[PDB]
Design a protein around this ligand. Structure first.
Ligand SMILES: *[C@@H]1O[C@H](CO)[C@@H](O[C@@H]2O[C@H](CO)[C@@H](O[C@@H]3O[C@H](CO[C@H]4O[C@H](CO)[C@@H](O)[C@H](O)[C@@H]4O)[C@@H](O)[C@H](O[C@H]4O[C@H](CO)[C@@H](O)[C@H](O)[C@@H]4O[C@H]4O[C@H](CO)[C@@H](O)[C@H](O)[C@@H]4O)[C@@H]3O)[C@H](O)[C@H]2NC(C)=O)[C@H](O)[C@H]1NC(C)=O
Ligand SMILES: *[C@@H]1O[C@H](CO)[C@@H](O[C@@H]2O[C@H](CO)[C@@H](O[C@@H]3O[C@H](CO)[C@@H](O)[C@H](O[C@H]4O[C@H](CO)[C@@H](O)[C@H](O)[C@@H]4O)[C@@H]3O)[C@H](O)[C@H]2NC(C)=O)[C@H](O)[C@H]1NC(C)=O
Ligand SMILES: *[C@@H]1O[C@H](CO)[C@@H](O[C@@H]2O[C@H](CO)[C@@H](O)[C@H](O)[C@H]2NC(C)=O)[C@H](O)[C@H]1NC(C)=O
Ligand SMILES: *[C@@H]1O[C@H](CO)[C@@H](O)[C@H](O)[C@H]1NC(C)=O
Ligand SMILES: *[C@@H]1O[C@H](CO)[C@@H](O)[C@H](O)[C@H]1NC(C)=O
Ligand SMILES: *[C@@H]1O[C@H](CO)[C@@H](O)[C@H](O)[C@H]1NC(C)=O
Ligand SMILES: *[C@@H]1O[C@H](CO)[C@@H](O)[C@H](O)[C@H]1NC(C)=O
Ligand SMILES: *[C@@H]1O[C@H](CO)[C@@H](O)[C@H](O)[C@H]1NC(C)=O
Ligand SMILES: *[C@@H]1O[C@H](CO)[C@@H](O)[C@H](O)[C@H]1NC(C)=O
Lengths: 128, 84, 48, 38, 105
């Protein structure tokens, strides 16, 4: 029964860096899931930010070129984003979610498929 | 046909053993090129798969393993590595 | 000449595009007859 | 195999070589000789 | 990158009617698609995973269908609680782009 909750205080100034941490409770982060972040600007559609696995393998949206990094901490059951060089277009509600996968082979070889972003968190509003 | 799921052939080398092996190789290379010389390992470049990959016969099948996870590092003076 | 399609086109693993289901007209014991054969080939063994 | 359709008996297992018609099959006596020292 | 298009842009329907939302993709994604429901300010919830498998805990009135480059979500006997935004996401290739979304009112 995963209960995700974002923190990540807002009011970040232009040219600064975001630090958004999603807490995981009710499970560990070593399960067969990718931890994912998405973005929803105030009145725009829903954008994908990126995913990190329990091993530190990451995937990012190419639009955030050299701007975003993700990390996990197994001792806290936490994961977070560090989005650099914010301007003004990054004001949005940010969400974390547990993207479930079905694994049939070796994860580093892509031998898995996605079962949808189950158990979304409540979201954190970030302004710039 | 293939029964069951389709999976990729691969080889596993542990990280600790390989890292110790490279440390020893660098230690010996520094005896020919001198100390305080940076030793960098990198993946192979061009040519046919016979020379760009690790070719071998495994049980009658011919494997061509990438190895670019085994040779990338710069040496300045159970957690396996899977090679497609 | 082989007539090939993708064996499992819905994979998302590193084998997408590898293993083609190729059909061909193969010879048989008698010189008058032909046999239609379907087989799987690796991408690296088959040239378009 | 199924005028009726037939095949040569060898098609199931082997190829046939036609023996040369000018080579006789009549046995010729062969004398076996030991090498020196035997 | 793959482009995801969702249409109609919006609908205005009554309670009890059946509606269909359709997602069109520039490439064949072999049913690696998922259908999310965003309940007017709440976090999106997963309705269909795998294009044609009902998500656990979702009412049976939500049923996905589709193949190839055309996928749709059919909502039978639409209720008041089902009004909100609907989104489609391709899991075929990264970035797992999210369709612009449709508003059901
Ligand atoms: C080199 O080192 C790597 C690690 O660095 C190692 O990778 C591991 O390989 C094995 C075998 O290739 C992988 O095993 C798979 O693991 C998943 C996940 O297992 C966890 O979660 C399940 C949840 O049910 C637990 O039961 C389990 O105990 C673990 O906690 C399994 O889901 C896999 O099983 C599926 O595939 C099998 C075939 O390989 C089927 O027999 C099995 O029935 C499962 O198939 C079913 O489910 C599928 C998914 O829904 C479905 O598509 C099928 O059609 C079917 O319904 C399997 O046990 C392991 O995960 C790899 N680990 C990592 C980290 O990637 C290499 O094996 C190693 N190689 C060498 C040579 O040393
Ligand atoms: C470096 O040395 C190691 C150790 O010798 C070697 O690994 C060994 O390879 C042999 C040959 O593949 C393995 O022996 C096989 O084991 C399987 C077990 O299921 C058997 O089924 C095999 O028998 C079949 O295949 C034979 C033909 O090879 C047939 O004659 C037979 O009738 C069967 O059809 C065979 O016995 C051996 O098990 C491994 N060793 C280990 C520990 O796995 C390795 O390959 C060498 N490196 C290189 C590059 O060659
Ligand atoms: C072995 O794998 C490496 C990657 O681990 C391959 O190098 C990559 O090649 C792609 C193009 O196909 C580039 O976009 C990546 O940036 C490369 N990565 C690195 C680290 O160089 C390499 O080509 C593979 N070799 C063979 C023979 O398949
Ligand atoms: C290889 O397999 C053996 C079991 O047969 C295991 O003990 C060993 O750790 C494995 N080595 C690697 C590098 O995975
Ligand atoms: C692994 O190799 C790196 C060199 O890139 C070295 O700095 C590190 O200490 C090594 N780790 C172990 C456990 O040997
Ligand atoms: C470093 O190189 C010098 C030669 O210039 C050699 O005499 C010395 O023993 C080397 N030291 C080590 C630790 O290898
Ligand atoms: C891996 O190789 C790339 C160049 O292909 C290099 O930039 C990178 O630093 C290497 N990784 C490490 C850990 O050195
Ligand atoms: C096999 O031969 C037939 C004609 O006898 C032809 O129509 C067919 O396309 C051929 N198939 C392949 C795979 O070449
Ligand atoms: C074909 O050969 C097999 C053995 O190779 C034999 O058992 C079979 O009877 C043969 N077929 C005919 C029609 O004689």
């Amino acid at each position: 029964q995963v209960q995700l909750q974002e923190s990540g205080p807002g009011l970040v100034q232009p040219s600064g860096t975001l630090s958004l941490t999603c807490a995981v409770s009710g499970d560990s982060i070593s399960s067969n899931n990718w931890w994912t972040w998405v973005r929803q600007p105030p009145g725009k559609g829903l954008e994908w930010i990126g995913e990190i696995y329990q091993s530190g393998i990451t995937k990012y949206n190419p639009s955030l070129k050299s701007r975003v990094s993700t990390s996990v901490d197994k001792s806290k059951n936490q994961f977070s984003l560090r989005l650099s060089s914010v301007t003004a277009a990054d004001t949005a509600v940010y969400y974390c979610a547990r993207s479930a996968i079905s694994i049939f082979g070796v994860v580093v070889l892509g031998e898995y498929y996605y079962n949808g972003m189950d158990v979304w968190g409540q979201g954190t509003t970030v302004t710039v | 046909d293939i029964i069951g799921d389709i999976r990729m052939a691969h080889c596993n080398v542990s990280k600790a053993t390989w890292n110790e092996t490279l440390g020893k190789v660098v230690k010996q290379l520094r005896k020919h090129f001198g100390n305080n010389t940076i030793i960098r390992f990198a993946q192979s470049s061009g040519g046919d798969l016979e020379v760009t990959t690790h070719s071998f016969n495994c049980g009658g099948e011919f494997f061509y393993c990438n190895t670019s996870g085994l040779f990338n590092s710069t040496w300045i003076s159970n957690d396996s590595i899977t090679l497609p | 000449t082989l007539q090939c399609t993708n064996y499992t086109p819905n994979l998302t693993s590193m084998m997408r595009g590898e293993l083609k289901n190729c059909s061909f007209n193969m010879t048989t014991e008698l010189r008058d007859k032909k046999q239609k054969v379907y087989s799987l080939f690796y991408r690296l063994d088959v040239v378009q | 195999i199924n005028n009726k359709e037939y095949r040569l008996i060898n098609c199931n297992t082997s190829a046939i070589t036609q023996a040369c018609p000018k080579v006789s099959f009549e046995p010729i006596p062969i004398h076996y000789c030991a090498p020196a020292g035997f | 990158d793959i482009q995801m298009t969702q249409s109609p842009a919006s609908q205005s329907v009554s309670v009890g009617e059946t509606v269909t939302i359709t997602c069109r993709v520039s490439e064949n994604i072999y049913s690696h698609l998922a259908w999310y429901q965003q309940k007017q300010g709440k976090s999106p919830q997963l309705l269909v995973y795998g294009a044609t498998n009902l998500a656990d805990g979702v009412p049976s009135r939500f049923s996905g269908s589709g193949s190839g480059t055309q996928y749709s979500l059919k909502i039978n006997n639409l209720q008041s609680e089902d009004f909100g935004s609907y989104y489609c996401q391709h899991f075929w290739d990264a970035p797992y782009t999210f369709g612009g979304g449709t508003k059901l009112e």
